[PDB]
Design an enzyme around this catalytic site. Structure first.
Site, PDB file in Angstrom:
ATOM      1  CG  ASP A  59      -0.340  -0.139   2.573  1.00 50.57           C
ATOM      2  OD1 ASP A  59       0.809   0.073   2.686  1.00 50.57           O
ATOM      3  OD2 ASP A  59      -1.005  -0.217   3.445  1.00 50.57           O
ATOM      4  CD  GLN A  61      -0.920   4.047   4.202  1.00 57.87           C
ATOM      5  OE1 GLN A  61      -2.036   4.136   3.558  1.00 57.87           O
ATOM      6  NE2 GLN A  61      -1.120   3.829   5.764  1.00 57.87           N
ATOM      7  CG  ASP A 138      26.307   8.895  13.027  1.00 59.05           C
ATOM      8  OD1 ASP A 138      25.637   8.228  12.963  1.00 59.05           O
ATOM      9  OD2 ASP A 138      27.007   9.508  14.023  1.00 59.05           O
ATOM     10  CG  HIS A 142      31.157   5.097   8.740  1.00 55.03           C
ATOM     11  ND1 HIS A 142      32.298   5.536   9.606  1.00 55.03           N
ATOM     12  CD2 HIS A 142      31.935   3.847   8.382  1.00 55.03           C
ATOM     13  CE1 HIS A 142      33.233   4.564   9.836  1.00 55.03           C
ATOM     14  NE2 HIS A 142      33.031   3.610   8.958  1.00 55.03           N
ATOM     15  CD  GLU A 143      29.961   0.850   7.308  1.00 50.78           C
ATOM     16  OE1 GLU A 143      30.747   0.486   6.286  1.00 50.78           O
ATOM     17  OE2 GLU A 143      30.375   0.878   8.543  1.00 50.78           O
ATOM     18  CG  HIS A 146      34.180   2.185   4.196  1.00 53.27           C
ATOM     19  ND1 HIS A 146      35.224   2.394   4.692  1.00 53.27           N
ATOM     20  CD2 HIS A 146      33.390   2.109   5.532  1.00 53.27           C
ATOM     21  CE1 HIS A 146      35.457   2.321   5.846  1.00 53.27           C
ATOM     22  NE2 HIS A 146      34.387   2.143   6.311  1.00 53.27           N
ATOM     23  CE1 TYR A 157      38.436  -0.222   6.767  1.00 56.11           C
ATOM     24  CE2 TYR A 157      38.360  -2.605   7.755  1.00 56.11           C
ATOM     25  CZ  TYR A 157      38.009  -1.005   7.823  1.00 56.11           C
ATOM     26  OH  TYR A 157      37.138  -0.683   8.641  1.00 56.11           O
ATOM     27  CD  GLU A 166      36.573   2.257   9.678  1.00 53.58           C
ATOM     28  OE1 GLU A 166      36.055   3.087  10.643  1.00 53.58           O
ATOM     29  OE2 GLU A 166      36.055   1.819   8.770  1.00 53.58           O
ATOM     30  CE1 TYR A 193      27.812   0.855  21.238  1.00 52.82           C
ATOM     31  CE2 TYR A 193      28.033   2.702  22.727  1.00 52.82           C
ATOM     32  CZ  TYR A 193      28.529   1.487  22.335  1.00 52.82           C
ATOM     33  OH  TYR A 193      29.545   0.738  22.964  1.00 52.82           O
ATOM     34  CB  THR A 194      24.188   1.756  24.627  1.00 55.26           C
ATOM     35  OG1 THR A 194      24.344   3.110  24.324  1.00 55.26           O
ATOM     36  CG2 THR A 194      25.331   0.892  24.504  1.00 55.26           C
ATOM     37  CG  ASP A 226      40.382  -2.651  14.374  1.00 56.26           C
ATOM     38  OD1 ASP A 226      39.457  -3.026  13.498  1.00 56.26           O
ATOM     39  OD2 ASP A 226      40.296  -1.404  14.913  1.00 56.26           O
ATOM     40  CG  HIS A 231      37.213   0.318  13.447  1.00 60.80           C
ATOM     41  ND1 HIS A 231      37.561  -1.051  12.926  1.00 60.80           N
ATOM     42  CD2 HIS A 231      36.092   0.551  12.510  1.00 60.80           C
ATOM     43  CE1 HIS A 231      36.597  -1.284  12.008  1.00 60.80           C
ATOM     44  NE2 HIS A 231      35.929  -0.298  11.682  1.00 60.80           N
TER      45      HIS A 231
HETATM   46 CA   LIG Z   1      23.028   5.046  24.008  1.00 67.19          CA
HETATM   47 CA   LIG Z   2      26.849  11.515  15.091  1.00 65.88          CA
HETATM   48 CA   LIG Z   3       2.369  -1.325   4.333  1.00 67.09          CA
HETATM   49 ZN   LIG Z   4      34.197   1.873   8.666  1.00 65.83          ZN
END
Ligand SMILES: [Ca+2]
Ligand SMILES: [Ca+2]
Ligand SMILES: [Ca+2]
Ligand SMILES: [Zn+2]
Ligand SMILES: [Ca+2]
Length: 316
Positions: A59, A61, A138, A142-143, A146, A157, A166, A193-194, A226, A231
């Site tokens: 639809d 939506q 962000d 960010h991605e 890359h 990398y 990075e 995040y969190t 890493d 990072h």
């Molecule tokens: Ca948080």
């Molecule tokens: Ca930010």
């Molecule tokens: Ca829908």
């Molecule tokens: Zn990255």
């Protein structure tokens, strides 16, 4: 898919209502025909087989909680497209309007998001460390940055070139957040995040050390984890970019800030004209100095500020 361009409405991950460019052919698909050769969003259906199915809705939506991550991946891809086009005259990530493809609902409780060489991929998070990762502009920018780097400098990398790769993504992810202008800041991933903890993020550009990242070359990580700390050591370059934009005194070295627009110009030029796959930190400093010189002149404040920022973080 072939059909007519239409306009749907839905809610993103954080409960915000927005319009999305869709395509109609029996179903309404998440396919935006208004930018380059298309922005296409797919459903990975909690699996890891990519891309999954082009997102189809009956639809037009998109208000179900299941819809939210796809609403944001699609919408924030369009914002990032607009940023590179309007600010840098860059058409999509390859500079030739390549289709932007993203898949959401990747795996189960996957606390991460990434560019896989061909497309964007977003986990839903486990609800404790992350909510759906496409909710962060962000993170999306960010991605996608890359992808831009892969088609330009091609920074390998690993080790220093990897930490630059990075940092470049943290810088333009942040400049995209400022461009969209909803609660912008110099941290990375705070919106997703969190959910139980106020005011934290994955990384800080203004104070990398907040989360244990080096803010000076003498603190670089030299181990193997890493990919040699891509990072971790990005904090050094993130701090330098923060200083170039905002100014400040960092370990006794004063930097005159030149603002976000000029930072974006200098680093876009470095990225696309001067950096190579094996560039180290010192070569980044030279590229940024040469960029600032091309844009503003060798005697400019802009050039002096680039030199001060790199001095402040120990990069000669
Ligand atoms: Ca948080
Ligand atoms: Ca930010
Ligand atoms: Ca829908
Ligand atoms: Zn990255
Ligand atoms: Ca923010």
């Amino acid at each position: 898919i072939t059909g007519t361009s239409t306009v749907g409405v839905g809610r993103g991950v954080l409960g915000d209502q927005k319009n999305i460019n869709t395509t109609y052919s029996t179903y309404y698909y998440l396919q935006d025909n208004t930018r380059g050769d298309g922005i296409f969003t797919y459903d990975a259906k909690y699996r890891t087989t990519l891309p999954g199915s082009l997102w189809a809705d009956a639809d037009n939506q998109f208000f179900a909680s299941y819809d939210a991550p796809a609403v944001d991946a699609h919408y924030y891809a369009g914002v990032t497209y607009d940023y590179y086009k309007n600010v840098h005259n860059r058409l999509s990530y390859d500079g030739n309007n390549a289709a932007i493809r993203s898949s959401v609902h990747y795996s189960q409780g996957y606390n991460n998001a990434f560019w896989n060489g061909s497309e964007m991929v977003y986990g839903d998070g486990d609800g404790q460390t992350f909510i759906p990762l496409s909710g962060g502009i962000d993170v999306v920018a960010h991605e996608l940055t890359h992808a831009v780097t892969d088609y330009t400098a091609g920074l390998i990398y690993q080790n220093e070139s990897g930490a630059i790769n990075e940092a470049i993504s943290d810088i333009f992810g942040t400049l995209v957040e400022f461009y969209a202008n909803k609660n912008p800041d110099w941290e990375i991933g705070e919106d997703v995040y969190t959910p139980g903890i106020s005011g934290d993020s994955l990384r800080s550009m203004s104070d990398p050390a907040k989360y244990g990242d080096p803010d000076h070359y003498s603190k670089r990580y030299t181990g193997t984890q890493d990919n040699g700390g891509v990072h971790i050591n990005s904090g050094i370059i993130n701090k330098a970019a923060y200083l170039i934009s905002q100014g400040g005194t960092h370990y006794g070295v004063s930097v005159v800030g030149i603002g976000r627009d000029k930072l974006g110009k200098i680093f876009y030029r470095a990225l696309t004209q001067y950096l190579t796959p094996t560039s180290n930190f010192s070569q980044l400093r030279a590229a940024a100095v040469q960029s600032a010189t091309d844009l503003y002149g060798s005697t400019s404040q802009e050039v002096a500020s680039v030199k001060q920022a790199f001095d402040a973080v120990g990069v000669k």
